[PDB]
Amino acid sequence: MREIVHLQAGQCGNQIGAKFWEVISDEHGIDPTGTYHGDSDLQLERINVYYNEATGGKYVPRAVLVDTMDSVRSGPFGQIFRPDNFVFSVLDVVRKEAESCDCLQGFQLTHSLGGGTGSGMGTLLISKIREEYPDRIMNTFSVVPSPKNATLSVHQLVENTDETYCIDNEALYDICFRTLKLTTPTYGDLNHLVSATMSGVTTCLRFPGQLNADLRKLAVNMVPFPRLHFFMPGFAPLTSRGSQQYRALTVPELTQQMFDAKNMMAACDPRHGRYLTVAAVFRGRMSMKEVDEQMLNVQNKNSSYFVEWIPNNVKTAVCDIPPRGLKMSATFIGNSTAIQELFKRISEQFTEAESNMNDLVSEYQQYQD
Amino acid sequence: MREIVHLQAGQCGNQIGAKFWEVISDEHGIDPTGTYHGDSDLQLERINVYYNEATGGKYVPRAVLVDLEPGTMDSVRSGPFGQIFRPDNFVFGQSGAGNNWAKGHYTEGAELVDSVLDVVRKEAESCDCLQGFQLTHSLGGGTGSGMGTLLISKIREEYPDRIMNTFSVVPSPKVSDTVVEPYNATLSVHQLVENTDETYCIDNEALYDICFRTLKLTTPTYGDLNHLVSATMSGVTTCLRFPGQLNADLRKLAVNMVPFPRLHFFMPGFAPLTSRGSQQYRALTVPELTQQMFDAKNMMAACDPRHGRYLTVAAVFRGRMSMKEVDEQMLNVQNKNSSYFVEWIPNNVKTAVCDIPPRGLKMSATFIGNSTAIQELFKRISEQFTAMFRRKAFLHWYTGEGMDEMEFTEAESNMNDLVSEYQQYQ
Amino acid sequence: MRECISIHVGQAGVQIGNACWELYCLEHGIQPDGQMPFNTFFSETGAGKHVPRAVFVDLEPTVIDEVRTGTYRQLFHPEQLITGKEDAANNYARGHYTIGKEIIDLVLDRIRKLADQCTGLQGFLVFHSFGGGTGSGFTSLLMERLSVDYGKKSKLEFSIYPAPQVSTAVVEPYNSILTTHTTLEHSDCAFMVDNEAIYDICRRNLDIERPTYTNLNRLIGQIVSSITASLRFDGALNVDLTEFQTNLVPYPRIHFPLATYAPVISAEKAYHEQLSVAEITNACFEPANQMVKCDPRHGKYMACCLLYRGDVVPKDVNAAIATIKTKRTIQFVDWCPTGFKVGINYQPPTVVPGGDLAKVQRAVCMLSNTTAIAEAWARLDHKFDLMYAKRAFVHWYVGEGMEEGEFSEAREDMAALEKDYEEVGVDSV
Amino acid sequence: LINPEDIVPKEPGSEETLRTIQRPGDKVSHQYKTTSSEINCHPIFGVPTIRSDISAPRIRRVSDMNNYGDEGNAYSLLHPSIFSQKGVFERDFFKTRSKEEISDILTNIGVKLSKEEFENVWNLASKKHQVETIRNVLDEL
Amino acid sequence: SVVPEAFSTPGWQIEKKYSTKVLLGNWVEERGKFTKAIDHTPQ
């Protein structure tokens, strides 16, 4: 029984966590005034993971907004929130919700690694929560600056969270121009796409799937050594207004676009990359010889490029509940050697913190060798 | 032919007994407007035990309902069964009882002779026969340990021969309501020793505990809490009221269970208790009722029966039953558990049988137990007495209505001498 | 009244347990709600209900919760459906040390409550696998706590063996080699299945492309119903449950036999060609029909236990057994000239409705203790060597209590198990 | 002016509450049925071991190894009826004879039968059937 | 000597309380309404 405390810290994290709550609320059938819609009985069974309820069908999240906030409440789903914890104290509200909780497992903090609010206050508040709950998992979704501040920020964060997600807007832009033919990248579209990538991995926590793996299991599976934990996301069945009727939908088809290089969230190079751990989380009603056969067939096509000296270089997960609209969908997540280039550029751009970044780059080098 | 007189007093006794005259209503099939509806003519031949007669077939209970307030008789008439109770025997008090045992016992001591004594002798003499006298007072209040417990020494002054049977509600520290419970309950258990032979003990934490561990209902009210005692009180006279195999009565339960004139504080139980979800998955037979019967979690006075050896143990039974295994598991539980019974007494178990099972059941087995760990109830209520007496803190409510300091010291000076008998024979 | 307790533990054993109690209920007149319009597996309450003997213990909430809302919710005791709080995350020190230690006082009473109800109890039917923190580590909690209490009793576990070429777990061989560390001491018949062969049995005989997991739970369902037919149905040649510890295991650490079930066939091939007694046992030995991934041609059979079923005649059996044992292909061991063992019963092969099988009159279940599975233990410690050299993936098993002091202690014990297919395989003079 | 249906509220088996409205394009019941939740008479194929469905041949080949059944149990070969000792058997019992054949059987087997009794015996035998039939009907009636 | 307990029998500690539709602690025994049925007094 897993639990979640969600905090929007810093501006970009605020507007992405707003879309997070909108996405989970539409997938769970709650009118934004808070009333429940109960078309199916699977919607309310594990609403205890992200919510606590109110008297008369009203529901309210376990989320704290700390840093814009008037704009968020003026936005689409502002009315769901608790107006008593809009802090701008944080210790009192985090023990209030974490003491009203029963058995805690993990925390969803939305921030960045490039600014004066998402980085310093992010590191301060992750310290202030790890000093309070040392047995949880901090999923801290993050935005780092483009390789074409973070050195101050990351060197307590890599000790603390181990669940950050750091490639960014240049890759998002090129995804939008090429694989979507999407003419005007609005900020809200990127917030939408990151938010759906958030919600893709939160179905083993909320729904009964088939191969049920919660966040602690994901931590044990993915992270070999305690400092190699920066991960790479991506969402597979995306296409344009035209190409739908020209494409087909199968597990071998979504395997192609979850290992498509132009689809992943990375302005990086898998041709210079080597995945230590892969997880492909599927949602839908799909046969599983297709899943396992396509898994190890696409691992069979590349013996060099998936990592040597590991027999199973991949992992699949699957749930019985697809997204809205799409019959089945996939979300690929990786832990490769294709990520130290960002570290090299951000280090070529206090001094002991720089030395610790050089230590992490040499850590990738000495383990790739 | 062996009629039973029930004396309900207090805010307690008019809401505990208000559930007690409901299972007497359906096990005799009594409508809430007086007349009997049914088919089986087994249960109107002994209707006179609890129900007097009038014209038109109407049956009103032999009942006494008294309080010093007018408070709770606007609630027992406000229930579903309020028309059943007799119109004159609600004996009123226009003032308030007001938490103290000083107002009811000595200030309203001269008032109760006109109030309750003149209704009882009007009634109890009018019956063609009599058996005994059964009163239910709260120890920790103002009317029950006020008006009621003086009457326990009043009718017993008139008729010494009969049997007193007090289902007494002694409080517990964990679930509490009033802070001066060493000042109304300690000042009544000194009177219970001389004047009440069969003295039960009911608690308010063990009763919630039974509706937590066993019936699994999460927000229990008082009405669900008062049928685990209202089944007990109706389930002890199951042989004075119905036919069967081996009938017992309220002298035959006291000879077996009272070896000594002061070793007479019992504690109750009730066998067939199982949850709200697993009704049919349990087979209610003999060896499962007697496994429910003996353990610590089932017993209604909040004490652990393992620290103290039972001197004597009673029971009763109902339902179409085969005698052999009933008499056989109570051969085992005396034999395997020789540590938790005393020596020097050969037999320790009594059993009695009826024929009719209760409403909606097949078997039942009410439990009555004399153990020497009722001193656990009477050490904690004297542990807090003199730890409060040394600051004399709430004494200035009691020197102003007509009792001295010197009767306060004697009520605990014999309270230990009760416990000095249970401890010696342990 | 030769009863057994049928636990279903872990995720990889409970969907089979969905299909296990389908097949027992449809076999008899018992409805899903347990009302009969059986005494091996079912306790009966006098209201009109029947209650199976099965406790469904797992740490994962949803797979038990999908049964209590499922169509079989009116079957079990709803205190047998036991759930903890958080999953074991495929971590041995989470399914046996930190979360599994919280639930062992409850399930010691629950095997005791059922066994005090049973009269002539003959053992256990646990259903687990060999990769799980809550499927392979946690079944070695429910094993050593029973032999200290129940001791000498016949335990039959159906455990999904980790396949040669496919898998889905990653940190699997760290505690599979720890599962065998105590189940050598306290397991007496630990049957095993690779699912990789059943992936291809469907592709050759069954006219099946794209098979789900729901089809493999039914074929695993029959093998459990083949071995348990001799308790609920009297036959010509019975095989009871204490007899399996003198038929099969010759030396006290060689107790790991295979399984198959020959006339798996659809409705368009079985119409065309017949099925005698002398050819369904010929179809047992062919290398395209064993349900575990193995090639038997490199292996010498030690002790088959052919379980027949349905309309068979015992001279037709012994006519067929001498045709096969004269064959120059399939080899045996010289110090077992006895070899085989039959079981003949008068109850037919059942069929699930809405299934893919055909109504065949005869069906067999051969349960062959063989030689050839030793070379599948060559790969299960070769896989273990490479991760453990660089201390890879150890940083989490050390998270919840386990240390390095046991991982090499288990490897030598799985090294010593591979030797014991060589002291007995090299023949005396 | 209200609907005749007002539902219970608590999920446990409650005080009344109104039926909650499922808004349009938000009915996910027809689409979100888990296969696991979904998981929550015929003719017979093969040969019989007795081969009673195929007719029996009159004169058998030497190569005939098929199971027909006409060979009864060993108890019926070790203690035969006099019919089996005389060489007559159950197909000669169960064969379709004629009215004149049964009429010749009656007055020559030692039974004197009325004409109406013979008609009633034939009617009772035809009602008993979907010699054995004639002897059984004559014994019972 | 103490005797064993399941999850969420006593509630002497203070818990938050849900409607019983949500599959929470002590859901089933309050989901099922308590049932009784009788015909008459036996002989």
**Cβ–Cβ below 8 Å for D40 and C313:** no
Contacts 24+ apart (CB under 8 A), A30-33: A30/A59, A30/A80, A31/D23, A32/A76, A32/A77, A32/A79, A32/A80, A33/A58, A33/A79, A33/A80
Write out residues 214-233 of A within 8 Å (CB-CB) of C. Answer: 214, 216-217, 219-221, 223-226
User: Which of A338, A218, A321, A368 has the alpha carbon at shortest distance from A266?
Assistant: A338
Residues C348 and C416 in one domain: no
Neighboring chain C residues of E6 at a CB cutoff of 8 Å = 79, 106
Place of tokens 């996301």: A233
> Is C212 annotated to bind ligand?
no
> At a CB cut-off of 8 Å and minimum separation 6, what does A257 contact?
A236, A237, A238, A263, A330
Helical segments of C44-189, H only: 61-68, 92-93, 104-117, 141-147, 173-186
**Integer Rg of chain E from CA:** 16
Beta bridge pairs of residue A50: none
Element (H, E) at A52: strand A51-53
Give the DSSP H or E segment for A51: strand A51-53
Q: Which two tokens stand for residue A56?
A: 């008369």
The residues that bridge with C301 in the sheet, in sequence order, are C332
C355 and C241 assigned to the same domain: no
**Residue C311, domain extent:** 258-372
Q: Which residues in chain B are immediately followed by a break of C to N over 2.5 Å?
A: none
Burial (0-12, 13-18, 19+ Cβ within 10 Å), D81: exposed
Query: Is residue B194 marked as binding?
Result: no
Catalytic member of C27, C44, C243, C375: C243
Query: Has C195 been labeled as part of a binding site?
Result: yes
Q: Which chains touch C (3 or more CB pairs under 8 A)?
A: A, B, D, E
Say whether residue A285 is in contact with chain D using an 8 A CB cutoff.
yes
Residue range B375-425, CATH number: 1.10.287.600
> Superfamily assignment of A230-339 in CATH?
Tubulin/FtsZ, C-terminal domain (3.30.1330.20)
Interchain contact A/B (3 or more Cβ pairs less than 8 Å): no
Contact A109, A78 (CB under 8 A): no
Say what the alpha-carbon torsion angle C292, C295, C296, C299 is, to the nearest 10 degrees: -110
DSSP β-bridge partners for residue A4: A106
Angle at C142 between CA C139 and CA C144, to 5 degrees: 105
Cβ(C21)–Cβ(C74) below 8 Å: no
- Pairing of the two strands B4-9 and B63-66: parallel
Report how far apart, in Å, the C-alpha atoms of C146 and of each of C107, C109, C112, C149, D64 are.
Answer: 10, 11, 10, 5, 60
Residue type, C8: H
Dihedral Cα A181, A184, A190, A196, nearest 10 deg: -50
What is the total residue count of chain E?
Answer: 43
Closest CA to D122 of D134, D136, D108: D134
Task: Give the bridge partners for A282, in sequence order.
Answer: A318, A330
C/D Cβ contact: 3+ pairs below 8 Å:
yes
Contact A153, A120 (CB under 8 A): yes
- Catalytic annotation present for C243: yes
Q: What are phi and psi of B112, to 5 degrees?
A: -80, -20
Whether C123 contacts C150, CB under 8 Å = no
The two most distant CA atoms of chain E are separated, in Å, by 49
Report the phi/psi class of residue C353: left, alpha or beta, with left for phi > 0 and alpha for psi in -120 to 50. Answer: beta
In the numeric block, the tokens 């001791």 are attached to: C151
The two three-digit tokens of residue D36, written as one number? 């696991």
CB A165 within 8 A of CB A233: yes
Of all residues in chain C, the one with the smallest CA distance to A46 is C62
CATH of the domain at C34: 3.40.50.1440
Burial of C201 per CB tally in 10 Å (0-12, 13-18, 19+)? buried
Q: Are B366 and B236 in contact (CB under 8 A)?
A: yes
Helix (H, G, I), strand (E, B) or coil at B7: strand
Tell how far CA D32 is from the center of its chain.
Answer: 45
User: Rounded distance, CA A36 to CA A56, Å?
Assistant: 10
Give the separation between CA C93 and CA C134, rounded to whole angstroms.
Answer: 10
Could you tell me which of B380, B23, B48, B40 has the C-alpha nearest to residue B240?
A: B48
Contact status of D27 with chain A (Cβ, < 8 Å)? yes
Residues 6+ apart with CB under 8 A from D74: none
- Tell me which chain C residue has its CA closest to the CA of residue A218: C89
Write out the residue limits of the CATH 1.10.287.600 domain(s) in chain B: 375-425
CB B237 within 8 A of CB B165: no
With beta carbons under 8 A apart, name residues in chain A contacting D21: 37
Are C268 and C249 found together in one domain?
Answer: no
Contacts of D45 in chain C (CB under 8 A): 267, 270-271, 358-360
Count of alpha carbons within 13 Å of A355, Cβ hemisphere only? 3
CB contact under 8 Å between B39 and E41, yes or no, is yes
Whether C89 and chain B come into contact, CB under 8 Å, resolves to no
Q: Rounded to a whole number, what is the distance in Å from the CA of E4 to chain D's nearest CA?
A: 26
Interface of E with C (CB under 8 A): 4, 6, 23, 28
| C83 marked ligand binding residue | no
Chain C residues inside the 8 Å CB shell of A312 = 167, 169-170
Three-class DSSP category at A342: helix
Alpha carbon distance A203, D65 (integer Å)? 65
- Residue B204 assigned ligand-binding role: yes
Q: Which homologous superfamily is B265-374 in? A: Tubulin/FtsZ, C-terminal domain (3.30.1330.20)
Long-range contact set of residues C268-271: C-beta below 8 Å, sequence gap at least 24: C268/C207, C269/C205, C269/C207, C270/C358, C270/C360, C270/D45, C270/D46, C271/C358, C271/D45
Cα nearest neighbour of B280 on chain C: C47
Sequential DSSP letters for A193-217: HHHHHHHHTSSTTTS--SS---HHH
Give the nearest chain E residue to D11 (CA atoms).
E21
Tell whether domain B3-257 is in CATH 3.40.50.1000: no
The Cα–Cα gap between C244 and C238 comes to 12
CA distance to B56, E35, E38, E40, per residue, from B38 (Å): 16, 22, 13, 8
* DSSP β-bridge partners for residue B60: B52
Q: Which of D10, D113, C248, B186 is nearest to E33 (CA)?
A: D10
The three-point CA angle C90-C95-C99 to 5° equals 125
For D10-49, the three-class secondary structure string (H helix, E strand, C coil) is CCCCCCCCCCCCCCCCCCCCCCCCCHHHHHCCCCCCCCCC
Tell me, what CATH number does C273's domain have? 3.30.1330.20
Comparing alpha-carbon positions, the chain D residue that sits nearest to C269 is D45
Strands (E), C116-269: 123-124, 127-129, 154-160, 189-193, 235-237
Q: What angle do CA B75, B79, B80 make, to 5 degrees?
A: 165
Of B209, B276, B296, which is closest to E30 when you measure between CB atoms?
Answer: B276
Domain count within chain C: 3
- B100 DSSP assignment: -
The gap from C-alpha A261 to its chain's centroid, in whole angstroms, comes to 19
CB A43 within 8 A of CB A321: no
A224, burial (CB in 10 Å: exposed 0-12, middle 13-18, buried 19+): buried
C389: left (phi over 0), alpha (psi -120 to 50) or beta: alpha
CATH (residue range A3-222): 3.40.50.1440
The residue behind tokens 């013979």 is D118
Give every CB contact of residue C192 below 8 A, 6+ residues apart in sequence.
C130, C158, C159, C160, C161, C256, C257, C258, C259, C292
β-strands B51-53, B59-61 pairing: antiparallel
Find chain E residues with C-beta within 8 A of B216's C-beta: 9, 26, 29-30
What is the DSSP-derived secondary structure letter of residue A275?
B
Do C109 and E4 lie within an 8 Å CB cutoff?
A: yes
Segment (H or E) for A267 = none
3-state secondary structure C70-87: CCCCCCCCCCCCEECCCC
Across A57-66, b (16+ Cβ under 10 Å) vs e yields: bebebbbbbb
Q: Please give the C-alpha separations between residue C309 and each of A243, B396, C29, C361, C364, in angstroms, as whole numbers.
A: 56, 91, 20, 9, 6
Backbone breaks in chain D after residues (C–N over 2.5 Å): 13, 40, 130
Neighbours of D85 (CB within 10 A): 8
Between E19, E28, E29, which is nearest D10 by CB?
A: E19
Q: Which residues of D touch C67 (CB under 8 A)?
A: 40
Residue C319 burial (CB count, 10 A) = 13
Give the whole-angstrom CA distance, residue A21 versus residue A58.
Answer: 15
Q: For the stretch B325-357, what's the b/e string if a residue is b when 16 or more beta carbons lie within 10 angstroms of its beta carbon?
A: ebeebbeebbeeeeebbeeeeeebbbebbbbbb
- Cα(B234)–Cα(B225) distance, integer angstroms: 15
Q: Which of residues 41-60 of C touch B (CB under 8 A)?
A: 45-47, 49, 51
- Experimental technique for the deposited model: cryo-EM
> Degrees (nearest 5) of the Cα angle A339, A340, A343?
115
**Nearest of C365, C350, C214 to residue C290 by alpha carbon:** C365
Which chains neighbour B (Cβ–Cβ under 8 Å, 3 or more pairs)? C, E
- Give CA–CA dist A359/A356, Å, rounded: 5
- Does C62 lie at the interface with A, CB-CB under 8 angstroms? yes
Q: Could you tell me the two tokens for C402?
A: 């386990």
Q: How many helices (H) and strands (E) does chain A have?
A: 12, 11
* C85 touching chain E per CB within 8 A: no
Residues of A within 8 A of C166 (CB-CB) are 292, 296
Q: Are residues C121 and C189 in the same domain?
A: yes
Q: Which residues of B touch C78 (CB under 8 A)?
A: 277-278, 281
Task: Find the distance separating the first CA and the last CA of chain D, reported in whole Å.
Answer: 75
Cβ partners under 8 Å of residue A244, min gap 6: none
| In a shared domain, residues C250 and C267 | no
Residue at token pair 């280039």:
A341
End-to-end CA distance of chain E: 44
Are C340 and C366 in contact by the 8 Å Cβ rule? The answer is: no
Give yes or no: residues C167 and C119 share one domain. Answer: yes
C413-419 own/partner pairs: CB under 8 Å, 24+ apart: C413/C177, C413/C180, C413/C181, C413/C184, C414/C177, C414/C180, C414/C377, C414/C380, C414/C381, C414/C384, C415/C381, C417/C180, C417/C184, C417/C253, C417/C377, C418/C374, C418/C377, C418/C378, C418/C381
Instruction: Looking at the structure, tell me whether residues C163 and C127 fall in a common domain.
Output: yes
Residue A227 burial (10 A CB sphere; 0-12, 13-18, 19+): middle
